[PDB]
Amino acid sequence: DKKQALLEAATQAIAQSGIAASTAVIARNAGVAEGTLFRYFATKDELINTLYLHLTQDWCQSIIMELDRSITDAKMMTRFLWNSWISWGLNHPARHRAIRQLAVSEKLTKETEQRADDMFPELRDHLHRNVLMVFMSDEYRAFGDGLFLALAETTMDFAARDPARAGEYIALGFEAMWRALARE
């Protein structure tokens, strides 16, 4: 599928260069021309919105596939979701780097933000109950996501480069994130 080829190529390019990644590079790496890229995505912004939804679906399905239903404590459930997030990023570091660039972008439309939330409603509701009010507000929700993604990517980076201590980085990063973002 050439649409999937373009999305995979856009993941790799945006992980490397951010949203500044060139659509000519992306198309060529997908094995297609820049013109047919724009026949799939009429604008670069449309490519960016669709890719963010594609990657959001990917990590949502992966984390839904691991959801431990025994966990009934709110902080332990958040630790499990954090662990699942770090694992996804360690397993797919390009996807995580790309999604971190996309999530903190002003190019995401309101329909995209709504569709991203609806892909994992149990998680959206869980965060509404446990995250500090300011980081669910209309004005500071994206910044709260940016702070989460920054602590998570740092945690992945140190876990990946020093795997003998990966569990420690992940638990220290979790505890740091929990008091940065969560209701005490």
Question: Which positions touch a copy of itself (CB under 8 A)?
Answer: 104, 106, 134-135, 139-140, 142-143, 146-147, 149-151, 153-154, 157-158, 161, 165, 168-169, 172-173, 176-177, 179-181
Contact flags string 80-109 toward ligand 08V, x per CB under 6 A: -xx-xx------------------------
Rg of the chain on CA atoms, in Å: 17
77 vs 83: CA distance, rounded Å: 10
Among 51, 55, 63, 156, binds ligand 08V (CB under 6 A): 63
Select 95 or 97, whichever has its Cβ closest to a copy of itself: 97
Select 71 or 142, whichever has its Cβ closest to a copy of itself: 142
Select 76 or 176, whichever has its Cβ closest to a copy of itself: 176
**Buried b or exposed e, range 71-107, using 16+ CB within 10 angstroms:** eeeeeebbbbbbbbbbbbbbebebbbbbbbbbbbbee
156 alpha-carbon distance from chain centroid: 13
CB of 97 to ligand 08V, least distance (A): 13
9 vs 17: CA distance, rounded Å: 12
**Buried b or exposed e, range 40-52, using 16+ CB within 10 angstroms:** bbeebbebbbbbb
Select 16 or 154, whichever has its Cβ closest to ligand 08V: 154
- 110-169 residues in contact with ligand 08V (CB under 6 A) are 123, 127, 131, 135, 144-145, 148
Select 7 or 151, whichever has its Cβ closest to a copy of itself: 151
Using Cβ positions, the residue closest to ligand 08V within the complex turns out to be 144
